[PDB]
Amino acid sequence: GWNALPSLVIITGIWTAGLFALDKVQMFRENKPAWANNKDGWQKALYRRDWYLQREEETLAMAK
Amino acid sequence: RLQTKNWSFEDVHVDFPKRLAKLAAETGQVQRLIHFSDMGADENHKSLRMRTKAVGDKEVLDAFPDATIVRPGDIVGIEDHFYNYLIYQLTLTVFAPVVESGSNKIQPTYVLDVADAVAALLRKPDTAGKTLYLGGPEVLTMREVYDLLLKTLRIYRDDTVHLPAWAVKAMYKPFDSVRRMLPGLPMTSPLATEDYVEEMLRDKVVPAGALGYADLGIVPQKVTDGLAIEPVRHARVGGYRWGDMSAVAKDIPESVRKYYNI
Amino acid sequence: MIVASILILIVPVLLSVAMFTLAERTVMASMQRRFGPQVSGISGLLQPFWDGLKLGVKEPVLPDSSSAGAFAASPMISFVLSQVAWVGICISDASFQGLVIMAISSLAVYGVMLAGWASNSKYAFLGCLRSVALMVSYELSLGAALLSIGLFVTDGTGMKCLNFAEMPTTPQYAMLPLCLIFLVCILAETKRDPFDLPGYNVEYSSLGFALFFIAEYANMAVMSAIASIYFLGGFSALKITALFFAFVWTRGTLPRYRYDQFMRLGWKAFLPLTLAFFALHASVAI
Amino acid sequence: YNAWSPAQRYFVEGDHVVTAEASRTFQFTGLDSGSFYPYVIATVIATAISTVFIVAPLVIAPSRVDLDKSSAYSVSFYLVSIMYLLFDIEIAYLFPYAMTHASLPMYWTMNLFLAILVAGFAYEWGMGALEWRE
Amino acid sequence: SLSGYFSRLLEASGKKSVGSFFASWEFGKMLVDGNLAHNVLVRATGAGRLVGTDYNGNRYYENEEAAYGRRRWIVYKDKFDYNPTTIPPEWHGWLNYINDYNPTNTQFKQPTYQIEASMTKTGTQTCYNPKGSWFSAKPRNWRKYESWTP
Amino acid sequence: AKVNNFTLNFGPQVLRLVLEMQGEIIMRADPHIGLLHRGTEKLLEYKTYLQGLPYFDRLDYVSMMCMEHSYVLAIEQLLNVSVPLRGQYIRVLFSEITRVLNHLLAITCHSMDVGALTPFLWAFEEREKLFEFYERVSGARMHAAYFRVGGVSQDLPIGLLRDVYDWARQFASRLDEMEELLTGNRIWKERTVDVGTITAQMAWDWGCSGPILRASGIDWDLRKTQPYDAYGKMQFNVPIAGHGDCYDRYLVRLQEMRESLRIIYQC
Amino acid sequence: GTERRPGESGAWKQIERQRYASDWENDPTFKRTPKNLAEVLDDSASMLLLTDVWRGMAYTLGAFFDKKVTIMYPFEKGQLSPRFRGEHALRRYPTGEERCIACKLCEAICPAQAITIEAEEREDGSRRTTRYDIDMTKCIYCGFCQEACPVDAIVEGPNFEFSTETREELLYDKQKLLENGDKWETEIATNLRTESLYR
Amino acid sequence: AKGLEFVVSKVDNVVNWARAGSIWPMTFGLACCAVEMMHAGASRYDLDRYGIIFRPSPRQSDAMIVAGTLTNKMAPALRKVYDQMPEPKWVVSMGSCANGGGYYHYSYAVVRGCDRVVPVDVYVPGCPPTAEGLLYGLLQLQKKIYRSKTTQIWYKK
Ligand SMILES: COC1=C(OC)C(=O)C(C/C=C(\C)CC/C=C(\C)CC/C=C(\C)CC/C=C(\C)CCC=C(C)C)=C(C)C1=O
Ligand code: SF4
Ligand code: SF4
Ligand code: SF4
C-alpha cells in the first residue's frame, strides 16, 4: 500500500548514501579503485616493494 | 538524607516542620500531629542532619504543644535505606569501608512495627506531647550487622576493610564539596557522606527510661531472623531455592513427587 | 582512517535496522488490508526511534537469581558479531571472505545459549536448545552451498578464492535450486516464518532487548547481502530491499513448522540436496 | 607490526623509512594486504557501543525494588551437536579441494572421501536415527 | 491542479498563506502527529465538499464516491488537543452514520435548558465528583437521622 | 529404563495445563479450570426469568443468541407458549448469522495459533459487518438480549434484509480467498492431518457434539433430527468427513459456513 | 486441494502405517500413485519447486495492491443505529419539568442492581425523586431500564466515549444524569422519533 | 538557569512523545471484553497504527489491559504478572466486570473491581465497550502520559 512506500524508499536511499560515503572515504584512504581485490603472494610482494621504493624515492628527494 | 542545590537540611528538617505546626495549630480541628525524627537526633551532633532534626523537633514541640515526636532506629523493609545500601556496599564495589572497628551500637526495627506504632499512638491519648524511641529487641554493632549480612548472602569473601575515620572522610570529601550546584544524582549512596561517618562514631540506641514499644503494648519483631531477613535471602548467590527436597519426600503421596519431578 | 571507515559503516547499519523494522510492520499491514504505524511522526516515520527511546528510559530488570555477567554478555555478543560481520562484508579484502562470514555467523549461536543458561526460566532453557538446534542444523547446508559457490570463483591471476570483489556481476542462472535452498536457509537462521516456533529473551527488558532485535535485523541484512553477492550478481540497495520485501511477504502468507518437522526437513532434505549439487558441480567444473 | 631488518625493508637505508612505517596509515594496497586488522577494531568499537547501551538505563530510568520482579516468569540435541561437529570437519576438509583447479585423480579421491561420508550418513538414515520422534 | 491543492489546504487549516501555514506550530505538530498530518494534508485536500461548521469551529466534509463508512470526516479546530467530545449532538448522529441529518438540512428543536458541548474534564481536578467526595464544596454525611445536640 | 515422567506447567496466561512428557512425547494432560467461574448458576436463582436472560449472552460470548435460544425454549415449553411465524424466521436467520460469526473466529484463531496471521485479519472485517447487523436490531454489537420468551424483542428495521443480502452476495468470495491460503498448503496439512483423531465410539462415549461429531462420520444435526422454530422448513446439507482429523474438522467447519449462508439466503 | 499423501500426515502412527501397509490406497481421499512419466513430473513439480506456496503468495501480493478498510479515528467514525445503548441519561419535558415520577420500575427490573432511588413529595405536591444513582461500573448496558420506564425518563443515549481516570467519576448521581440529558436532548429526540414506530 | 530549564522541559516533551507513541500492552483476555480488544487490533481500527504492539512477556510490556472479569482464583496470578512489569507502567481497566464486578458483583467468586488488586490509570466503561470506545480510552491514557514532567521534577529536587 501507499503507507509502505516511504519506509521502503528510505531504506534504499539510506543504503545508497551510506555506500557512496563509505566508497569516497575508502577511496581517499587507498587511492585506487581496486583495493578490495584478491591478492596472492606475488601481488603482496609487488605492493610491498612499491611501498618501500616509494619511501626510498622520498628519502633521496630530500637530499638535493 | 543528602543535600542538594535546591534543598538544604534546614529547609526540610526545620523551616517546613515549623510552618506545618503553625498552620496545624491555626485550624483548630487538628487533634494530633505525628512528626518523625531519628533515634540519633541530637543538637550537639557533628552530623548536620541529626542536628537539624533535633532543632526541628524543638520547633514542632514549641508551635504545636500536643504534637508527638517519634524517633525510630534503622528501619528494615523491602524498599528500605538500611539493608539495601549495605548489600549494595557488600556487592557491586571493589571494597566496603567500615568506619573504625565497627563497634558502634544500633537498634534496628521493622517497618510494620512502626506502622502499628502510629495507630497505637492514635489510640492512646496520653502519648500526645511525648517523645518515643522505637527500637527492636536486639542491640547490635555494625560489625555484627555486616557479619549477619555476609552469612545470609552466602558470600565467602569478606570484602570489608576497617579504616580510620579521617581516611573515610578523605574519601567522601570530593563528593561532598560538589553536592551543591547539582540537582541530585541517581545511585548516590547516603552512606558516602561525612555525616554518616560522624553517625558511625556514636551509639544510636534507646535511652534509659524512655518511652518505647512496650508502653504502646507492642512486642517488636526480630530483625535478624524471620520475615524481615527474607528479602536479603533472595539476593544470595545462585538464588534462594529449596534444596534437594528428597529426605522429606519419602512418605509424601503419589502425585506430589511426580508433580515436583522428585 | 580505519576507525573512521568503520563508524561511517556503522551509521547506515543502525539507521537501516530501524527502517527495516518499520517497513516490516507496514508491509505486513498492507498485505492484511490495514495501514500500520502512521500516527507516530508524519507517515509513522518516527515509530522505531520512539521505540528505541522508550526502551532507553525503561527500567532494566536484573533478576537476583541469575549470573549477571553472562546475562549482560549475551545481547552484547549478538550485537558485536552482527557489526563485525558487516565490517567483513564491506571493509575487507581477504581471500576467504565468505568463509570469514560463515565463521562469524557460526559464532552467533552463543548469545542464544548464554541467554538460555543465564536466565532462570524453565522454558527459556527449553527453547534455547531448540533454537540452537535449528541454527546448527541449517549451518551445514549453508556451508555446502558455499562449497558449490566457490568451485567457480577465480580471480584474474587464476587463483580460486571467496573474495567478494572477484564474484561475477551476472545472476547465477545455473544454481537456481541452490539459490532457493540458500534463501530458505536464511529464513531458518533468523528464526523467521516458517521456523519461528522457538522465547530466549523472555527475561530481557529495555536496551538489552533492543540489542537483541538490532542484532537480529542486522544479521538478516548480512545474509541478504551475502545472497545477493553469491547469486544475484552483486551487492546493491535495490537487491537488499527486494529480498527484505520477499522475507516479509513469506512471513505474511505462511504458517510455521513443528520442531521435528523442520529438523527432518533440514537433515533429510536440504543437506543431501546441497551435497548432491556439490558433487554435480564438481563433476561439471573438471 | 613494523619491519625489524634491512632485508624486510627491501634494503632501503635511512631513518625516514623506519618512522614512515611506524606512523603509516593502514592501506590494503601498501603494506597491509589481506590484513584482518579492521576485524579487531570493529570488535573494540562495537563492544564500546553495546556497553554504552547496557550502562545508560541505569541512570535515566525509574526503578522500584520488588521481590516478585526479580523472579522467574532429550538426547536429540546430543545427536545434532555431534553430527554437526563431524559434518563441519568434513566440509572443512572439502574446502581445500574447491579452492584448487583439480585434476581427475583429485576428483576421484574427493569422491571416495564423500562416498565414505554419505555411506555413514545413509546408515544412520536407514536405522531411523534422523527421525526426530524422540 | 496544485493551486486547488493549496486553496484546499488554506481553507482547511484556517491560515491565510502558505508561509503562515508552514511557519506555524500547527505544522510543527503535524510533523510529529501523523494522524493530524494525514487528516489535514491528505483527506481534507482530496475529493469532497464542505458541509458545515459547528459552534466550536470544527469543519465537516463528505464524499459520496468514497467507500461506505468512510464518506464523512471532521477537521477539528483544536489542532493541539483534538477530542471527539467537542462534537455537538446535532453533528454526532451525522458523523457516526446514525442519521442523515445535520443543521445544514434539518432544523432541530432547541430546548431552553440545553447545555452546549465542550471538551471532557477528566484527569483534572474540576471533573465530576459525587456529593460525598473530598473535592466537593461541602461533603455530605448521609445519615438518615438527626442527632441530639444539648 | 525406569524413565520418570517430566512434567510441565503450561500457562497461567485462562487455561492452566499440567502436562507429562516422556521426552518429546506427551503421556498425560490435566486441564485445571475455574479461573473464569463466576457462579452464574447460583446468581440465576436470585433473578426473575427476564432478569436472568442477559446471563446467557455471557456464556459463549462468541455465539450469543444461540445461548439465549435454549433458555428461551425451555421457558416457553413449560409456559406452553407458541411463537408466531415471523419470529421463528427471525430466530433462525439470526441463529445462522451467529454460527457464521463463531466459525469465522474459530477457524482464524486456530490458524493464528498454528502460525498463519493473515486469515485472522481478513475474517474480522466480515465479523465487523455481522456485528453491525446485530447492532442495527438490538443496539448492542455482542450482548444483544434479542430473543425473548414468545418471540423476539423488536421488529427488524426497514432496510436490514437489503444489506444482509448484499453481504451474503460476497461472503462466498471471502470464504474462497480464505481457503487459498490454507486448504492446499503443505504446512497446514502437516500440522493438521491425523492430529488428535476421534472415532465414533469415542465421540459418543465422550459426549461429543457439533462439527467434531460430523468429522468422524456421524450424521447427527439437531436442526434436522429434533428441529426447533422453522428449521424443518430449511433446505441444507450436513457435511460429513471420516478421519476424525483436525484437517477434517476444518473442512467441515468451512462447509458449515456455506450451509449457514444457504439458510440465510432462504430466510 | 484436500487430497492426502503418504508422508504428509502430521502424526507418527499414520506415518508408520502408510510406509508399512497399502491400506491408504483403498481410501478415496488419498492421491493415487502416478502411472506414467508425465504424472511423475507433475507430482515432482508439486513437491519440489513448491507451487502451492506460490498461490497463497500471489493472493497476498494481490491484497498488497488492494484497498484498505481502516478508518482514521477520531477524525472518522464507525456506523451505529438509533437503537444503540450508550451512556444513561435523564430527560425533561419541553417545559423543563422532569419526566421521572419515582415509580421505581427501572430499579426493580435492573438485573445488576445498578440503580438506587429515594423519593418524597415535592413542596408543590408532585411525586419526584430525591436520589437517583446509577453505578456505571455495575451496569451491564442491557437497556431493560429504558424498556421499563413508562414516561421515557431514563434512556441510553448515543454516547460511547466517556472513559475517565478515576472510578469515582463513574458513580453518576441525579444531577449529572440530568446534565447528560440536557446535553444530548436533541439527538435523543431525533432517535426516538424513528424508534417510536417500532417500540 | 533559564536555558537549562528550557532544555529540561524539552527533554520531558521528547520523552513523553516517545512513551505515549510506543505503548506495548499485555493482554489479559479473561472474558467477553477480550473479543472487542481483538476487534480493536483488527484491520478496521488498527491499534498498530498508533504504535501499539501486543507483547507476550511482562518484561517488555509498558501497560496492562484488564479485559474481562477477575475471580478470586485469578487475582494472585494477575498481581504476580503485574509485579513483573518494569517501570514506568500503566493499567487500563476495560468493561464493567473489571471496573466494579459488573453483573457478577454479588457473587461468592468474583473480585469487585481490579482496583482492589492493582492500581488503575484509565477506566473504560461498557459491557462490552466498543472497540472505538477502547480507542478513546487509550487516547486518554496518551493524554495522561503527555502531562507528565519527569526531568523537570528531577531538576528541582
Ligand atoms: C513485528 O516486528 C517488530 C517487533 O517484534 C519483533 C518489535 O519488537 C518492534 C519494536 C522494537 C524496536 C523498534 C527495537 C529495535 C530498534 C531500535 C532500538 C532502533 C535502532 C536505532 C538507532 C540506534 C538509531 C536511533 C538513534 C539516533 C537517531 C540518535 C539520536 C541522538 C540524538 C538526537 C542526539 C518493531 C518495530 C517490529 O516491527
Ligand atoms: S441499562 Fe441495564 S444495567 Fe444499565 S441501568 Fe438500565 S437496567 Fe441497569
Ligand atoms: S426513570 Fe422512569 S422507570 Fe425509573 S423511576 Fe423514573 S419514571 Fe420510574
Ligand atoms: S464486562 Fe461484560 S462483555 Fe466485558 S467481560 Fe464482563 S460480562 Fe463480558
Q: What is the DSSP string of B236-255?
A: SSS--------SSSSSS-HH
**Whether F213 contacts F220, CB under 8 Å:** yes
Kindly report whether the peptide bond that precedes residue C194 is cis, defined as omega within 30 degrees of 0.
yes
B169 CB-contact burial (10 Å; exposed 0-12 / middle 13-18 / buried 19+)? middle
CA-CA distance, C137 to C272, in Å (whole number)? 12
Name the 3-class secondary structure at F44: helix
Provide the β-strand partners of residue F19.
F8, F29
Residues with Cβ within 8 Å of residue E24, at least 6 apart in sequence: E15
Q: Which helix (DSSP H) or strand (DSSP E) does residue B109 occupy?
A: strand B109-110
Ligand nearest to the CA of F139: 2
Provide the β-strand partners of residue G120.
G128
In the numeric block, which cell numbers belong to residue C254? Answer: 505462511
**Whether B101 contacts B167, CB under 8 Å:** no
What's the gap in Å between C211 CA and the centre of ligand 1?
9
Pairing of strands E72-75, H25-29: unpaired
CA E6 to chain CA centroid, nearest Å = 24
CA-CA distance, G57 to F227, in Å (whole number)? 44
CA-CA distance, B164 to C137, in Å (whole number)? 62
Strand ranges (DSSP E) for F130-180?
A: 147-148, 151-152
Rounded to the nearest 5°, which phi and psi values hold at E59?
A: -105, 145
Contact D/A (≥3 CB pairs under 8 Å)? yes
CB atoms within 10 A of CB B87: 17
**Whether H126 contacts F141, CB under 8 Å:** no
Rounded to the nearest 5°, which phi and psi values hold at C69?
A: -70, -50
CA-CA distance, F92 to F95, in Å (whole number)? 5
CA-CA distance, F58 to E30, in Å (whole number)? 43
Q: What is the experimental resolution, given in Å to one decimal place?
A: 2.5
Provide the β-strand partners of residue B131.
B69
What's the gap in Å between F140 CA and the centre of ligand 3?
22
The C-alpha torsion from B25 through B27 and B33 to B35, rounded to 10°, is -70
* G149 annotated binding-site participant: yes
* Amino acid letter for position F175: L
Residues with Cβ within 8 Å of residue C138, at least 6 apart in sequence: C185, C188, C189, C266, C270
Q: Which residues of H are less than 8 Å from F143 in CB distance?
A: 32, 127-128
In the numeric block, which cell numbers belong to residue G6? Answer: 503418504
Nearest to E130 among G76, G171, G187 (CB): G171
Ligand nearest to the CA of F141: 4
- Elucidated via: cryo-EM
> b or e along C41-80 (b: 16 or more beta carbons within 10 Å of the residue's beta carbon)?
bbbbbbbbbbbbbbbbbbbbbbbbbbbeeebbbbbbbbbb
CA C241 to chain CA centroid, nearest Å = 14
Provide the β-strand partners of residue E105.
none
Q: Do H80 and D66 touch (CB under 8 A)?
A: no
Which residue do the cell numbers 481536578 mark? E125
CA-CA distance, D10 to D12, in Å (whole number)? 6
* Amino acid letter for position D115: A
* Closest listed residue to residue C215, CA positions, set C227, C202, C229, C201: C201
Q: Which residues of B sit in the known binding site?
A: 1, 53, 73, 81
CA-CA distance, B256 to B236, in Å (whole number)? 28
Q: If you ran DSSP here, which 8-state letter would residue E42 be given?
A: I
CA-CA distance, F113 to D39, in Å (whole number)? 43
Distances (CA, A) of C218 to A15, B189, B249, C84, C208: 13, 40, 51, 11, 15
CA-CA distance, G17 to B194, in Å (whole number)? 82
Provide the β-strand partners of residue F6.
F21
Among residues 44-73 of chain H, which lie with CB inside 8 Å of chain D?
57-59
In the numeric block, which cell numbers belong to residue G182? Answer: 440536557
Q: What angle do CA H117, H121, H125 make, to 5 degrees?
A: 90
**Whether D81 contacts C134, CB under 8 Å:** no
The C-alpha torsion from H97 through H102 and H103 to H104, rounded to 10°, is 70
CA Rg value for chain D: 28
Name the 3-class secondary structure at E37: helix
Q: Name the residue of F58, F59, F64, F141 to mutate for ligand 4: max ligand atoms within 8 A of Cβ.
A: F58
**Whether E80 contacts E29, CB under 8 Å:** yes
* Closest listed residue to residue C55, CA positions, set H108, A8, H51, H43: H51
Mutate to test the interface with A, among D11, D25, D28, D35 (most CBs of A within 10 A): D28
Q: What angle do CA C158, C161, C165 make, to 5 degrees?
A: 95
**Whether C231 contacts C152, CB under 8 Å:** no
Pairing of strands G154-156, E59-62: unpaired
Distance (Å) from the alpha carbon of C30 to chain D's nearest alpha carbon:
33
Name the 3-class secondary structure at D6: coil
Provide the β-strand partners of residue E74.
E60
CB atoms within 10 A of CB B191: 22
CA H102 to chain CA centroid, nearest Å = 19
CA Rg value for chain H: 17
Length in residues, chain E: 150
Among residues 1-30 of chain A, which lie with CB inside 8 Å of chain G?
1, 4
* Amino acid letter for position C209: F
Contact B/G (≥3 CB pairs under 8 Å)? no
CB atoms within 10 A of CB H102: 30
Mutate to test the interface with D, among A55, A58, A59, A62 (most CBs of D within 10 A): A55
Q: What angle do CA H75, H77, H78 make, to 5 degrees?
A: 65
* Closest listed residue to residue A40, CA positions, set B160, D78, D128, C157: C157
In the numeric block, which cell numbers belong to residue D97? Answer: 579441494
| DSSP-assigned letters across all residues of A6-47 | HHHHHHHHHHHHHHHHHHHHHHHHHSSTTTTS---HHHHHHH
Residues with Cβ within 8 Å of residue C59, at least 6 apart in sequence: C205, C206, D57, D61, D62, D63, D64, H86, H87, H88
The strand order across the sheet containing B131-134 reads B34-36, B68-72, B131-134
CA-CA distance, F45 to B121, in Å (whole number)? 49
Rounded to the nearest 5°, which phi and psi values hold at C75?
A: -70, -25
In the numeric block, which cell numbers belong to residue G181? Answer: 440529558
Half-sphere exposure of C5 (CA within 13 A, CB side): 27
Q: If you ran DSSP here, which 8-state letter would residue B12 be given?
A: I
Q: Do F38 and H109 touch (CB under 8 A)?
A: yes
* G103 annotated binding-site participant: yes
Q: Which helix (DSSP H) or strand (DSSP E) does residue C244 occupy?
A: helix C237-253
Rounded to the nearest 5°, which phi and psi values hold at A59?
A: -65, -40
CA-CA distance, F205 to F196, in Å (whole number)? 16
CA-CA distance, C275 to C236, in Å (whole number)? 29
Looking at chain D, which subunits does it touch, using at least 3 CB pairs closer than 8 Å as the criterion?
A, B, C, F, H
**Whether C19 contacts C48, CB under 8 Å:** yes
CB atoms within 10 A of CB G31: 14
In the numeric block, which cell numbers belong to residue F188? Answer: 497446514
Q: Do H39 and F58 touch (CB under 8 A)?
A: no
CA-CA distance, B186 to B198, in Å (whole number)? 23
For helices C109-118 and C97-107, angle between their N-to-C axes, nearest 10 degrees: 10
Closest atom of ligand 3 to CA, residue G152 = 2
CA-CA distance, H83 to H66, in Å (whole number)? 14
CA-CA distance, B136 to B118, in Å (whole number)? 16
Q: Whose CA is nearest to atom 3 of ligand 3?
A: G149
Ligand nearest to the CA of C21: 1
Name the 3-class secondary structure at F193: coil
CA-CA distance, D62 to D70, in Å (whole number)? 16
* Amino acid letter for position A40: D
CB atoms within 10 A of CB E12: 19
In the numeric block, which cell numbers belong to residue A1? Answer: 500500500
Mutate to test the interface with G, among H47, H92, H97, H105 (most CBs of G within 10 A): H105
Q: Whose CA is nearest to atom 7 of ligand 3?
A: G100
Provide the β-strand partners of residue F26.
F21
Q: What angle do CA C10, C12, C18 make, to 5 degrees?
A: 110
Q: Whose CA is nearest to atom 8 of ligand 4?
A: H32
In the numeric block, which cell numbers belong to residue D110? Answer: 574427493
CA-CA distance, G92 to G94, in Å (whole number)? 6
**Whether H28 contacts H98, CB under 8 Å:** no
Q: Do A7 and C19 touch (CB under 8 A)?
A: yes
3-state DSSP percent of chain E in helix, strand and coil, to 5: 30, 10, 60
**Whether C209 contacts C266, CB under 8 Å:** no
Distances (CA, A) of F8 to B156, B243, C234, H58: 35, 20, 49, 20
Distance (Å) from the alpha carbon of G111 to chain E's nearest alpha carbon:
24
Distances (CA, A) of G79 to C92, E103, G69, H129: 61, 20, 13, 15
Rounded to the nearest 5°, which phi and psi values hold at C18?
A: -60, -45
* Closest listed residue to residue F66, CA positions, set F262, F197, F233, F260: F260
CA-CA distance, B196 to H27, in Å (whole number)? 47
Name the 3-class secondary structure at C46: coil
**Whether B132 contacts B71, CB under 8 Å:** yes
